[PDB]
Design a protein around this ligand. Structure first.
Ligand code: CYC
Ligand code: PEB
Ligand code: PEB
Ligand code: PEB
Ligand code: CYC
Ligand code: CYC
Ligand code: PEB
Ligand code: CYC
Ligand code: CYC
Ligand code: CYC
Lengths: 172, 160, 87, 49, 22, 173, 132, 162, 161, 172, 160, 161
């Protein structure tokens, strides 16, 4: 696990040199955008049950063969393990947004998840559809003002969509 | 009908119709008055023959209507009786045609492909037609019940 | 295959959803589970209504006549101090 | 295939008799062609030409 | 050509056309 | 599998009152009924040794013969003698003792960015040997709820239904 | 080399096994154990992860106010069709001709078809080489 | 599943021994009760549709807000009403599975494991399903030891929801 | 009947030249997706009956084709459909593996729209069945594999139109 | 692990259906056999030490290289492991017996066993000879009268012989 | 487009294209990286351009939406805006084709026969397109409102 | 009679959708080659008589179709050729500008091979004349422009075959 500040130190250490003056100033822009990064994460964790349940509900409307009985996520238990997966991925996408680096997302969430679903028989193409529904439910709740001052958070919601796209590709 | 396949039989054999074929077209058309009376009985008894038909079908096969059965709910049960109205209609055609040729190319040819592809238990729909048969033959005399029941059990045979 | 399972005639081991063959023991494919229903008689065309297989008009004989007898000239041959190795 | 234009009761006479090895292929084809499944499709709706 | 066969005119059927509300 | 169908509220009560230790709590979770239903009944004796070495001892199976060597404890002594033998190894008592919850020991090297694929992801509850038997089945002829009409429902590109909830906005002014 | 994995070297059970009852030792390696999985490099100055300093939000409807040889070429252009089009515009309006025939579509549907392109019907002229 | 047969194999398997006479008596007691159990499962199946449409109507009579309130969780649409009767049919089907098997094993595996997490997530109320199961307990029409076996698994579902 | 390798070899052979860098460049592109196509063709073989059951129930099962008069009324006519839809889901699987739609028009498309007009089969409902069948096929094989299998469905729908 | 009764429930839950009326009548015949299915399990449990030892002694008389030095059943620890394996396969055949149905046999015993004996060097063609000798010792002891009332148990010893044949072809 | 009818013009005349024709195909393709900007503005403004478009249409022609008007009720008013979405789409084609040739053979040729045969007042739909034109030209500047409006008024001319 | 823009608009219109990124992606590809096609059509207009004079002298000038009995003997018949070859070099110029061969079969290809069989015009010598005419056209307009103009010549040769 390393964030965006520790990744420029880990790369400068394998060169054996101090950070430059333009590498400190690029990190001072990331400190000035810190309060707006903290309100992306505050909005996606204060609505964590609404991102997951409304996107699950939209998935079995679109792919209704997943909930017949006999299917992959019905035993009351396979439905609860399906919502467990959507809640885990949203947890580690939110961990990667407060860090600025997708290191914790693929060290301990995406590490071997594609081959877990192949040994189980879970369709990884439908898990990717479910992540893409949690993505635009999260970027729509990110660029609404509603208790934040008005400004430009445009490059922060582009980064948040990048971790959602990294998780959806890495699963199928 | 007996008229059309007694023709296409003698058609293929490059010949006309024998006395064995023409004394039965003759014997069938004099039978035609009695056939329309029999089909006329089943025509305006479809309300009881179908509804009591699905009566015994659910009492004998509660799985198909229970939750998980193919005909579960207000919706499928209506279609559950719709097919019985179909097959009761085709039996009226077979009685007037004097053969299961109308029932053959409608509701019998490739019927297992449809019901297997619909998820319906084909044995269950066979049980439905048998329940209709006891209601139908209970509406007619013994001389007629040997006919109206006679076309149902052919449909029972081809439906399994 | 779905009709035979739905009719309770016999369950046919098909494929899992990714297309690997089903099997109860993971060595070879299409192995089935057994026990207490494949040896029970009288239900062969079970759930196929009014099925007529074999002499349905009579109960079969008990046939509980288990004895092995000296099978002269056809007792099977196999090596000594050994067990034959399948090709 | 026989599926969408047969009823099931037509040529199981010929299949089981052939699966058991009782008849060769040519008898199976000749008995197939001279069954009423054939003339119900290839002889009835067309002329002799 | 049989006891059940299709003719275009007797088709009274919004399926050659596809107004999906019927 | 942390559901309240699988909680053990009386094992929890004896741990809060200092009657059992954590080594007895860890033993009681392996011998519990949810662990035998969801895990032991969907593995053979060899893959279940791999599950219980990775989760109780905190380390990976050395080779495929360690799996063979320990699977005969389950077949002759049952599951209760296998977890007594595992919990009484010196590998367990030197690392966790009887008061520490186990963990995956030495998963990540100190200066690296990646890890070693944590053990709940490396072995899920069933694998390839039971996949061809219990793998659910996308589209299973279950006869579920029907949808009824479809071209009205999510209308085609030329349809006039798309601008209907826009007619109110045009309104009368 | 060594023994195979797990085999205590010297305590093999296939030492003096008979050939008639010998069973071939299956092949097993240190792959599926977790100690031999390849980790990220991370001492050569490379971590496999991704975060901030990666993601860029590129506006690609809006590259810039588009290049001068579009605006340059976008005008020259309608200085050369402007005289065309308004000549073709009120060629429509007081071309308000009367009506022939019977209305075959409601109240319209008369002799000529509405707004029909005359160049199509009139542009394909049949020609005889050595016309006679 | 948890049957009377598999809880006898498991008792002998948990110590690595053969099936003693302790375990043959438990399997024998399953066979004596199975006559009343397989006639209750046959009778709940035979009247399943008239028991599900009645029990959904009993929920709408007691809790009439579920047919009027807008929202996805409620049966205030034709799609929400079909999903309500789908759930009543799930609870009735598991009861007739427990009667066939002989223990509370099918509905432990398919229904009650993970049920509290669904009702919290999708905003369903366990008092809707208790009222639906109290209808079936009073309206199945059985009597004798046939009704004793049917009510023993209906009361198992009411105790997990409450 | 050419796959991606057969089509690449044909074009490189038809000019009499060897397999240069551009011809092998596409061949390497086909071998990269070789792993994706087999798993796509794997699950489609498993859920063949389930996919066709989902398409007809989602497209034309709920319409009025099935009414006495619609194009699909009698059981022979209904059974011909799922037989007919099986070829579209099957031959599309072949195009997905071969990476070239030559097999479709060779064995499916030619004389097809000219045949449905003879029988009076509605081409409009046919394409929507294949479109719905394409929609469920993207469910199973995933997004990009659905993009591959979907690329041959509309090829059938285009030529059948 | 599921019995004969839970097998038809698991097959009907994959369709999401109630049980048919012929499926319930075929389960009432398994209840009617009953008392005599329990006679077969009682007869091969009361003789389980002698099924194993008499068919072990018969195995090393026909295949004497198994107990020669270098053979697979030559040492004290290797001989006691051959008798331990015969007693385990006989245990899970009688389980697939008390409950009717082989899901303790090919989930608990037969799954992965062919690939295990190959990793150990154990000749799986000779394990199959020792299983087929326990089959003849069990079916000759299943159909003897000896304290049971006279009747037809022929369809139940055809099922007991079928479990022994399943374990003997899945071991090699 | 300008490319296809500059060809078919010189095609009919048995000749190639003059400098007057080839210095405009040249002049049009360099104009081609700016249309895809003008058409891109109208592409994802159809939500506002079509209403408002129907905004001013009903305020200026309340007869067509009043009871008795052709677009009366929830149904016809939806189709009342559907046609405006059509004609707004064809203007995006004409802008990219550099000519009303796409608008000519779609929505203009024989348009009076359709709307007369539908009972729709053709003058009313002409008023609708004019209301869309003021909304469209209000979304752009300089040359273009001289272009985007330029294709609407051609549609106004042919629609009466 | 559709150009590349007309064909792109038709396919995007025939589904009732707007011009998405894929439809404009091909349109941008056509506008990039807009400069090349005009200069290609420029020089072909200049050297129209020279190209046809080069093709006939290089393919079928001295063959025995030119001699008595051959298909091109009389002066009316010879004069019909260069009149006939002028259309192929002219209509191919239109396809090169429009970027779509729809104009060829609309105005050249239909009833063409059925007409030459009526007159008894040798289709074999006709295609080789167009092939030789394609060879000289690549001389003038260059390589890639010859690839563009050449792409419609063999379209005529294919359909005329
Ligand atoms: C709606 C979601 C889709 C779906 C999900 C589904 N997943 C499972 C099972 C597992 N998921 C994981 C994943 C993780 N475990 C972790 O520890 C982490 C990091 C913290 C991740 C990302 C694992 C390991 C399992 C299996 C192990 C277990 O359950 O014990 C299941 C249950 C499968 C089963 O039969 O048990 C479901 C249903 N399934 C779908 O259909 C949706 C598309
Ligand atoms: C983009 C995500 C939002 C948005 C964000 C802005 N927030 C701004 C300032 C600000 N935010 C906070 C709260 C933050 N600090 C915390 O400690 C925690 C949680 C513990 C949170 C959520 C504070 C305290 C401040 C004031 C400090 C400051 O202004 O830097 C902000 C700056 C406003 C400006 O432009 O001056 C922005 C843009 N605003 C948006 O419009 C989107 C929706
Ligand atoms: C010396 C002339 C050879 C040679 C041969 C080696 N053989 C090895 C092992 C081996 N040999 C056999 C066959 C043997 N066993 C029998 O039962 C019979 C006949 C009844 C015969 C001929 C077997 C089955 C085996 C494997 C079991 C075992 O270990 O004995 C061997 C050892 C291999 C190893 O351990 O890696 C060797 C080295 N040795 C030579 O160098 C030349 C080639
Ligand atoms: C079959 C392999 C045998 C055989 C078996 C029969 N047993 C019959 C009846 C019966 N069995 C029991 C004991 C039941 N309780 C237990 O604890 C155990 C296991 C230790 C068992 C099996 C009882 C109490 C009864 C009598 C009860 C009754 O019949 O209602 C039986 C039926 C008698 C008959 O059909 O005539 C049979 C056939 N008999 C044989 O000959 C073979 C060797
Ligand atoms: C009817 C009594 C009341 C009601 C029902 C209702 N339920 C849902 C949604 C779900 N119900 C389940 C329950 C199960 N699924 C299973 O697989 C099993 C075991 C076999 C059970 C018990 C689940 C998982 C859902 C959510 C997934 C789905 O939509 O299918 C709804 C829909 C709610 C929604 O869509 O959010 C409704 C309406 N609600 C009422 O108002 C009735 C009183
Ligand atoms: C005896 C008839 C044959 C034979 C047997 C033999 N087996 C072993 C060793 C093992 N056998 C097992 C077997 C099982 N493990 C299980 O979990 C189950 C149920 C699934 C079974 C059936 C295991 C795990 C071992 C290894 C552990 C151990 O020490 O036993 C041996 C010993 C091999 C050795 O010492 O290296 C023997 C001799 N061999 C024969 O020759 C007979 C044909
Ligand atoms: C003597 C007066 C004089 C001028 C004012 C310029 C005027 C001018 N600008 C550009 C052309 C250009 N000039 C720029 C430059 C920039 N775009 C930006 O946003 C930045 C502010 C800046 C770079 C730092 C770009 C990007 C183009 C290309 C425009 C296009 O995309 O077509 C060109 C065409 C090619 C070129 O020479 O660049 C000309 C002649 N040249 C002159 O000779
Ligand atoms: C004239 C010959 C003929 C027949 C027989 C016929 C059957 C037929 N049955 C159908 C459905 C159905 N049929 C059933 C039937 C049953 N459910 C049960 O439990 C019972 C066992 C069984 C009835 C006794 C059900 C539940 C459906 C709806 C299935 C679904 O919605 O998925 C449908 C699809 C919907 C429709 O168009 O009606 C057809 C075409 N068509 C024909 O032309
Ligand atoms: C491999 C390429 C290939 C195809 C595709 C093919 C089609 C084909 N479809 C047919 C019939 C048919 N096809 C349908 C299909 C439909 N009805 C509908 O309403 C739907 C729109 C549609 C299902 C999607 C029906 C109902 C018939 C029977 C027509 C009749 O009996 O008149 C027939 C007549 C003979 C027969 O089915 O035995 C052929 C040959 N043949 C081929 O070689
Ligand atoms: C792309 C060129 C093009 C156009 C323009 C077009 C028009 C068109 N307008 C229609 C209907 C209609 N159009 C209107 C229109 C109006 N009512 C008013 O009051 C206003 C004056 C006016 C709109 C601004 C109404 C009310 C109907 C329904 C008429 C009816 O239901 O009888 C219909 C029949 C239903 C349908 O298929 O949509 C067509 C085909 N089709 C085309 O391909």
């Amino acid at each position: 696990m390393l964030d965006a500040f520790a990744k420029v130190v880990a790369q400068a250490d394998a060169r054996g040199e101090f950070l430059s003056n333009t590498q400190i100033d690029a990190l001072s822009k990331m400190v000035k955008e810190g309060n707006q990064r903290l309100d992306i994460v505050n909005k996606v964790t204060s609505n964590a049950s609404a991102i997951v349940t409304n996107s699950a509900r939209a998935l079995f409307a679109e792919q209704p063969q997943l909930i017949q009985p006999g299917g992959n996520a019905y035993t009351s238990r396979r439905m609860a393990a399906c919502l467990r997966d959507m809640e885990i991925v949203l947890r580690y996408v939110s961990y990667a947004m407060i860090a600025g680096d997708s290191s914790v997302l693929d060290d301990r969430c995406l590490n071997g998840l594609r081959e877990t679903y192949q040994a189980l028989g879970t369709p990884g193409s439908s898990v990717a559809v479910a992540i893409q529904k949690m993505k635009d439910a999260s970027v729509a709740l990110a660029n609404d003002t509603t208790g934040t001052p008005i400004g430009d958070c445009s490059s922060l919601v582009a980064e948040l969509a990048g971790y959602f796209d990294r998780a959806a590709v890495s699963v199928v | 009908s007996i008229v059309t396949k007694s023709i296409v039989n003698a058609d293929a054999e490059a010949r006309y119709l024998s006395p064995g074929e023409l004394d039965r077209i003759k014997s069938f058309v004099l039978s035609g008055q009695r056939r329309l009376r029999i089909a006329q009985t089943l025509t305006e008894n479809r309300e009881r023959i179908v509804k009591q038909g699905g009566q015994q079908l659910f009492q004998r096969r509660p799985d198909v209507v229970s939750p998980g059965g193919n005909a579960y709910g207000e919706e499928m049960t209506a279609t559950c009786l719709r097919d019985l109205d179909y097959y009761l209609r085709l039996v009226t055609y077979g009685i007037i045609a004097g053969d299961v040729t109308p029932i053959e190319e409608i509701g019998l040819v490739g019927v297992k492909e449809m019901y297997s592809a619909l998820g319906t238990p084909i044995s269950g729909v066979a049980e439905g037609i048998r329940c209709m048969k006891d209601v139908a033959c209970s509406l007619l005399s013994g001389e007629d019940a040997a006919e109206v029941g006679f076309y149902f059990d052919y449909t029972l045979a081809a439906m399994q | 295959a779905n009709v035979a399972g739905q009719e309770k005639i016999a369950t046919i081991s098909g494929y899992t959803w990714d297309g690997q063959p089903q099997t109860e023991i993971p060595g070879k494919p299409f192995v089935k589970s057994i026990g207490a229903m494949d040896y029970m008689d009288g239900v062969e065309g079970g759930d196929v209504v009014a099925a007529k297989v074999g002499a349905f008009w009579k109960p079969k004989a008990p046939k509980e006549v288990p004895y092995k007898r000296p099978m002269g000239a056809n007792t099977p041959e196999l090596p000594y101090n050994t067990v034959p190795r399948l090709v | 295939d026989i599926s969408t234009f047969v009823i099931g009761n037509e040529i199981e006479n010929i299949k089981i008799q052939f699966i058991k090895g009782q008849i060769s292929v040519k008898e199976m084809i000749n008995a197939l062609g001279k069954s009423s499944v054939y003339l119900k499709e290839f002889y009835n709706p067309y002329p002799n030409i | 050509s049989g006891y059940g066969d299709y003719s275009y005119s007797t088709d009274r059927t919004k399926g050659h056309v596809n107004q999906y509300y019927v | 599998q942390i559901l309240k169908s699988t909680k053990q509220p009386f094992l929890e009560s004896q741990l809060r009152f200092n009657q059992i230790s954590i080594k007895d709590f860890i033993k009681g979770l392996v011998l519990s009924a949810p662990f035998r239903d969801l895990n032991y009944n969907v593995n053979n004796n060899y893959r279940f040794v791999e599950i219980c070495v990775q989760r109780v001892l905190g380390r990976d199976i050395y080779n495929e013969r360690e799996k063979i060597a320990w699977s005969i404890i389950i077949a002759t002594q049952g599951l209760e003698g296998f977890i007594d033998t595992l919990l009484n190894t010196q590998e367990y008592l030197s690392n966790f003792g009887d008061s520490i919850v186990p963990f995956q020991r030495r998963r990540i090297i100190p200066q690296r960015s990646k890890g070693e694929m944590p053990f709940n992801l490396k072995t899920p509850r069933y694998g390839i040997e039971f996949r061809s038997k219990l793998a659910a089945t996308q589209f299973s002829w279950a006869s579920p709820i029907r949808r009824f009409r479809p071209q009205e429902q999510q209308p085609k590109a030329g349809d006039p239904a798309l601008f209907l909830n826009m007619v109110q906005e045009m309104g009368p002014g | 080399q060594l023994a195979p994995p797990g085999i205590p070297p010297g305590e093999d059970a296939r030492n003096n096994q008979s050939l008639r009852q010998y069973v071939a030792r299956p092949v097993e390696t240190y792959q599926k154990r977790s100690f031999a999985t390849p980790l990220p490099l991370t001492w050569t100055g490379e971590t496999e992860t991704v975060g901030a300093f990666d993601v860029v939000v590129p506006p690609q409807e809006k590259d810039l106010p588009v290049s001068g040889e579009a605006t340059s070429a976008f005008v020259k252009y309608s200085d050369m069709v402007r005289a065309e089009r308004k000549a073709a515009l009120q060629a429509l309006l007081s071309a308000s001709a009367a009506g022939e025939g019977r209305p075959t579509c409601g109240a319209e549907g008369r002799k000529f078809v509405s707004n029909a392109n005359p160049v199509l019907v009139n542009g394909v002229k049949c020609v005889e080489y050595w016309r006679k | 599943m948890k049957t009377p047969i598999t809880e006898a194999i498991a008792t002998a398997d948990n110590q690595g021994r053969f099936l003693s006479n302790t375990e043959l008596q438990a399997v024998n007691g399953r066979y004596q009760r199975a006559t009343a159990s397989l006639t209750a499962a046959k009778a709940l199946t035979g009247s399943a549709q008239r028991l599900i449409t009645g029990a959904a109507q009993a929920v709408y009579n007691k809790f009439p807000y579920t047919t009027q309130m807008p929202g996805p969780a409620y049966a205030s649409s034709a799609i929400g009403k079909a999903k309500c009767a789908r759930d009543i049919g799930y609870y009735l089907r598991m009861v007739t599975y427990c009667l066939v098997v002989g223990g509370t094993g099918p509905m432990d595996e398919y229904l009650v494991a993970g049920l509290e997490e669904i009702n919290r997530s999708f905003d369903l109320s366990p008092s809707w399903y208790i009222e639906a199961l109290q209808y079936i307990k009073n309206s199945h029409g059985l009597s004798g030891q046939v009704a004793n076996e049917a009510n023993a698994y209906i009361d198992y579902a009411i105790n997990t929801l409450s | 009947m050419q796959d991606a390798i057969t089509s690449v070899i044909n074009a490189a052979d038809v000019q009499g030249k060897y397999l240069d860098a551009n011809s092998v460049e596409k061949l390497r592109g086909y071998f990269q997706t070789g792993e994706l196509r087999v798993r796509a063709a794997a699950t489609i073989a498993a859920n063949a009956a389930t996919i066709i059951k989902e398409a007809v129930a989602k497209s034309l099962l709920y319409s009025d084709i099935t009414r006495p008069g619609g194009n699909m009324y009698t059981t022979r006519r209904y059974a011909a459909c799922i037989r007919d839809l099986d070829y579209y889901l099957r031959y599309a699987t072949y195009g997905m593996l071969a990476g070239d739609p030559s097999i479709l028009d060779e064995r499916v498309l030619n004389g097809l729209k000219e045949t449905y007009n003879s029988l009076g089969v509605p081409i409009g409902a046919t394409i929507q069945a294949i479109q719905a069948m394409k929609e469920v096929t993207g469910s199973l094989v995933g997004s990009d594999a659905g993009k591959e299998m979907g690329l041959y469905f509309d090829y059938i729908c285009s030529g059948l139109s």
